[PDB]
Amino acid sequence: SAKAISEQTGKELLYKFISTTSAIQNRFKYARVTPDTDWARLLQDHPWLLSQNLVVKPDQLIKRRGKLGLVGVNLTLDGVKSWLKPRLGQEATVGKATGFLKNFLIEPFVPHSQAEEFYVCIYATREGDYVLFHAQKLLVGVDEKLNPEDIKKHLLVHAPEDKKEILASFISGLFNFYEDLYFTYLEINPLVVTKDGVYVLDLAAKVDATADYICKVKWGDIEFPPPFGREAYPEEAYIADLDAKSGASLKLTLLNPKGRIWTMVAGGGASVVYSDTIGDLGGVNELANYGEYSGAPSEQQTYDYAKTILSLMTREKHPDGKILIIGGSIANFTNVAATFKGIVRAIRDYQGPLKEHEVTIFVRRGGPNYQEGLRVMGEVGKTTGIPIHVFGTETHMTAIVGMALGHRPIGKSTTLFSRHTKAIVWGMQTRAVQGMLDFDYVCSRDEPSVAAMVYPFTGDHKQKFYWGHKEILIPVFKNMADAMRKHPEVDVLINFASLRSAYDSTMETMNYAQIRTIAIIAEGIPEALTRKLIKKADQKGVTIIGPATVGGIKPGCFKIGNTGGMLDNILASKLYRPGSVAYVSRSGGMSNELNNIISRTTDGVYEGVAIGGDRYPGSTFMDHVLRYQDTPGVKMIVVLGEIGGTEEYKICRGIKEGRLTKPIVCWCIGTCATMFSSEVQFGHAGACANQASETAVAKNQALKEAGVFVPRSFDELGEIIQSVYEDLVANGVIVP
Ligand code: NA
């Protein structure tokens, strides 16, 4: 996810690391003011405070501080102390948000003309980074460079020739700094340029937090502050530390520490849906947290996550007690037994405080070993006396929310996969490959879908597998070149590389034209690298599914890695033979919920794809919707959209232009995001809305107006899918 940084942090980074021949005035002339400031030290460390006039403002992610009257301008140091006395430690309201003014930044006042102020902004898109100046707009493409002469010719057309060389030089330095330190947004408004040089009067910025492993040295102990209106809490940092030390995903944001509605949901998608449901039932004001765990965390990691929740919800008593919602989709991959054993351990260690605080627990879960998981979850309820109501896959995912709240407890290729698909798997993933072979067998495939594996940290060798009951060998290669030249029949590669090596291994794969489809599994790739992956993929005509995805499945033909889980899920959801329903979602866990939902209301899934949660997926919703339009076996299309970006609108335009004619059912998750006083970023790195059009509510209305079938909520998604299906059956379009 991209995260905002304070103005001081951004100016800190800029003063230290901008590489420019321009003169940047007042570098390191700032002073941070908190209620705990030692004002004697402050004057000692920043003596310029006493010898020139100053500017004071809060540094707490509040924009338009001028229009809000939150900027003392051209004051002496004594005037600053006085300007601060009514304001420091006092509440303030910016739009919907209310919070304490507690962090201020003092800087020298810069006498300047109105004409010496300039606007500069750099922000990232899929196609590269745009540079704004004034409004002049220039696109720097992926893997391109910003020629200072390109700045002079497009940005500085209406600029005086004398100021033209310091502006181009500063912007060139600012852009390289922007790129080197993995910024995604950098705004200076105003940038003051006088005869003495360049002044950075204001700075707002966001950096790609996933690039920590690349930028550690220069970022230092970088601080990502909460949005104005909310506070930061030590438990969030603790969980974020668990997230860094694990390939699994672990996230937690506190919304209301005193609220009585607590969630511990698996999956970035599912956790947004439970929050949406809670919001629809009036519980937003009592919603204590948003968070998720996914990517198959261990028993121990899940215990550490769960115990943070249980401690946070036993800090004080609520007269009506409290409720804990332990939900999730039917997981593809996460071990339900292993993770619920960890939650059970936490519940056990906190059973005293939980009974003391009158906590009622509601559980809904499916996935690998979910029967054991639900059993041990009911066992701990009986031995502790804690009321725990447990439900399985038979129960609608969000049903436990209503139970808990209804009262207070008393164009690229059309076809990617076929029965004949042969794939290379990058990484050591015996369990994933075996899960694919089991699926291939019950699908009545002639041959295994995995022809070879590649892992450059071991030598060439064979690997035993089970094909049905018989045992077989699949070659494992150290060098990708060897696997490719010996298996020209392979056209799919499923990349299980970690986030650190996924970039290079995927770029290497695209040197082999025989590979037409690449699934990138890893979550946490920096967005700027994925853009380079997208650029090369587009140049080579290679379809990329991912990153940050479990993959997808084509019943009867092929399934990417862990998608679809164990045989018992393959059989229950009828994923061993195709139906007429195709779907695409961002969430991998929710995609398996759709497998189950579609299995129960139609003839079954024809093909399903999870494009991943990252901001720039290798393939988009529209890309796969188009494939389904052009696939005759597909008769209806289901899209599980999400807040953030404008991708779903391309579906609207496609209908309006006659390109898309088959029935489309779509629901966009994230409707509760607009109910909050502050912004909240969900589990998926791309689930962030800037404009009103990027909200799930706005997209749902737009989709519905264009002829898409949109349910009222996620709860009715299964209803409207069954209803569209039966029409097609009645009209003869589908014959089971
Ligand atoms: Na992680």
Side-chain angles (χ1 to χ4, degrees), residues 242-251 499 523:
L242 303 185
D243 192 33
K245 306 175 175 176
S246 175
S249 186
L250 302 156
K251 302 196 194 315
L499 63 94
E523 183 167 352

Side-chain angles (χ1 to χ4, degrees), residues 663-675:
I664 297 179
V665 176
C666 182
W667 173 253
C668 293
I669 69 173
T671 55
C672 74
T674 179
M675 303 183 185

Side-chain angles (χ1 to χ4, degrees), residues 479-520:
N479 299 316
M480 181 176 299
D482 294 331
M484 296 291 171
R485 63 189 189 88
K486 285 183 177 181
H487 298 276
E489 80 280 4
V490 163
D491 75 320
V492 178
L493 182 142
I494 305 174
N495 194 354
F496 279 99
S498 78
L499 63 94
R500 295 166 312 280
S501 59
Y503 176 76
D504 297 292
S505 58
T506 303
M507 293 293 273
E508 191 187 0
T509 306
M510 290 189 289
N511 292 336
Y512 298 97
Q514 73 196 261
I515 307 301
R516 309 313 310 164
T517 299
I518 297 171
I520 309 171

Side-chain angles (χ1 to χ4, degrees), residues 644-661:
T646 60
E647 175 61 25
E648 290 76 358
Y649 291 105
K650 299 174 184 175
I651 301 173
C652 300
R653 282 186 287 280
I655 292 173
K656 202 150 187 295
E657 302 170 341
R659 180 63 170 97
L660 307 177
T661 70

Side-chain angles (χ1 to χ4, degrees), residues 368-686:
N369 307 312
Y370 76 89
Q371 304 84 357
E372 179 181 9
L374 300 182
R375 186 182 47 79
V376 300
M377 185 73 64
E379 188 68 20
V380 74
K382 287 165 187 165
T383 67
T384 61
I386 296 178
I388 309 183
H389 314 298
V390 180
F391 305 88
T393 59
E394 75 294 335
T395 308
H396 291 9
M397 190 181 83
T398 58
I400 56 175
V401 178
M403 307 185 198
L405 273 60
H407 67 105
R408 301 158 186 180
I410 306 170
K412 288 173 189 184
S413 173
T414 289
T415 301
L416 302 178
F417 315 114
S418 67
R419 285 199 322 113
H420 311 104
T421 296
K422 301 275 197 161
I424 287 164
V425 171
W426 198 105
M428 201 46 64
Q429 302 283 339
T430 294
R431 289 188 180 178
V433 172
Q434 187 58 64
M436 290 169 67
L437 302 199
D438 296 333
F439 162 90
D440 299 326
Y441 186 80
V442 298
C443 287
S444 304
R445 273 181 59 115
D446 303 336
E447 304 176 316
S449 61
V450 171
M453 306 179 68
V454 175
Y455 194 54
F457 305 96
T458 175
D460 300 346
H461 59 276
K462 305 288 181 303
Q463 176 68 228
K464 295 176 177 180
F465 284 103
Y466 276 97
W467 174 247
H469 299 307
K470 308 187 178 187
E471 175 174 320
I472 64 171
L473 300 191
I474 299 185
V476 180
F477 296 86
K478 172 180 180 192
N479 299 316
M480 181 176 299
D482 294 331
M484 296 291 171
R485 63 189 189 88
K486 285 183 177 181
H487 298 276
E489 80 280 4
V490 163
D491 75 320
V492 178
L493 182 142
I494 305 174
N495 194 354
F496 279 99
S498 78
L499 63 94
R500 295 166 312 280
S501 59
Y503 176 76
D504 297 292
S505 58
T506 303
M507 293 293 273
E508 191 187 0
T509 306
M510 290 189 289
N511 292 336
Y512 298 97
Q514 73 196 261
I515 307 301
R516 309 313 310 164
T517 299
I518 297 171
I520 309 171
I521 304 295
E523 183 167 352
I525 301 175
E527 303 173 354
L529 297 181
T530 297
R531 295 191 311 193
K532 291 168 179 181
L533 291 177
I534 290 164
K535 175 172 174 195
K536 198 177 180 187
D538 293 353
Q539 292 170 335
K540 301 287 195 174
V542 171
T543 301
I544 291 198
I545 295 175
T549 180
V550 72
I553 180 173
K554 179 172 185 175
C557 294
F558 187 73
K559 82 184 191 84
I560 295 167
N562 295 126
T563 312
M566 298 178 162
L567 266 175
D568 71 322
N569 180 77
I570 298 297
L571 298 178
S573 291
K574 262 54 185 177
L575 298 171
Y576 55 86
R577 89 292 182 272
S580 308
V581 193
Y583 72 85
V584 55
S585 60
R586 271 184 178 277
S587 163
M590 291 310 300
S591 78
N592 201 28
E593 194 74 33
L594 294 177
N595 292 335
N596 176 67
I597 293 170
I598 293 165
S599 180
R600 297 181 186 181
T601 53
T602 67
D603 56 351
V605 168
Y606 181 96
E607 187 175 24
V609 175
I611 63 168
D614 284 352
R615 203 193 146 179
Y616 313 119
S619 46
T620 66
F621 281 137
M622 192 59 185
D623 287 343
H624 292 279
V625 170
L626 287 169
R627 297 198 307 104
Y628 298 150
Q629 173 66 39
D630 304 337
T631 302
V634 174
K635 306 292 168 48
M636 56 180 298
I637 303 171
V638 176
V639 177
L640 190 66
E642 192 155 358
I643 178 169
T646 60
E647 175 61 25
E648 290 76 358
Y649 291 105
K650 299 174 184 175
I651 301 173
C652 300
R653 282 186 287 280
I655 292 173
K656 202 150 187 295
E657 302 170 341
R659 180 63 170 97
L660 307 177
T661 70
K662 304 190 192 178
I664 297 179
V665 176
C666 182
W667 173 253
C668 293
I669 69 173
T671 55
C672 74
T674 179
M675 303 183 185
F676 298 118
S677 57
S678 302
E679 282 207 345
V680 59
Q681 55 181 10
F682 298 115
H684 293 158

Side-chain angles (χ1 to χ4, degrees), residues 635 725-736:
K635 306 292 168 48
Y725 177 73
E726 295 295 349
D727 296 353
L728 292 181
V729 175
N731 294 13
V733 182
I734 300 181
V735 178

